[PDB]
Design a binder for this molecule. Structure first.
Ligand code: JPZ
Ligand code: ZN
Length: 199
């Protein structure tokens, strides 16, 4: 049930990408191989401690969401947690940690920025063979700053706890959520999957 709901979120949030599959590959669905719940007590406590602080600063509301994250460094994240020190000013919203509500958007980052050179074995961004991993995360957004265009931030805007990138004509196709403190996300589920060749 718990894993069926994670599988459903993974499958149902897939969208057709503007890049025609360049970064993440060509697919309409995934072959979900495994869903593992990450139980890291020290990371969970770091997350809940920050979540309580953010709630107190946001009218007793953490504004928590379950969001996807794609990265070549999922193993390091599950053990050491998210780390803003690995985030640099180059992204659309600057030096933050980025999440998506659409699994296929996070899938574009699994092998690096713009999909990098794809899977290590075949150097294929559309590899249907190699097993990929995504995280489905608990993310504390708190008072989230709504933004449409590029705004290179080092930290959350004054009085805020995150940035939400909203879709716009000359901007984003899909939403994205950005935190600037690693302790504001917990890597709750590790999903192992393949993208599937369209029928
Ligand atoms: O999951 C992500 N991993 C890195 N960059 C992103 C940018 C936007 C939305 C999601 C992501
Ligand atoms: Zn491959």
């Amino acid at each position: 049930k718990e894993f069926q709901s994670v599988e459903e979120e993974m499958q149902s949030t897939v969208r057709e990408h503007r890049d025609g599959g360049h970064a993440g590959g060509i697919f309409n669905r995934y072959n979900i191989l495994k869903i593992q719940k990450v139980c890291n007590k020290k990371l969970w406590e770091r997350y809940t401690h920050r979540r309580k602080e953010v709630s107190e600063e946001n009218h007793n509301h953490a504004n928590e969401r379950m969001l996807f994250h794609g990265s070549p460094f999922v193993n390091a994240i599950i053990h050491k947690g998210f780390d803003e020190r690995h985030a640099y000013i180059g992204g659309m919203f600057g030096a933050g940690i980025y999440f998506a509500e659409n699994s296929s958007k996070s899938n574009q980052y699994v092998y690096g920025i713009g999909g990098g050179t794809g899977c290590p074995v075949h150097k294929d961004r559309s590899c249907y063979i190699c097993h990929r991993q995504l995280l489905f995360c608990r993310v504390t957004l708190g008072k989230s700053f709504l933004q449409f265009s590029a705004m290179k931030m080092a930290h959350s805007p004054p009085g805020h706890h995150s940035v939400t990138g909203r879709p716009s004509v000359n901007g984003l196709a899909l939403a994205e959520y950005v935190i600037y403190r690693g302790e504001q996300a917990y890597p709750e589920y590790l999903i192992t999957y393949q993208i599937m060749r369209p029928e």
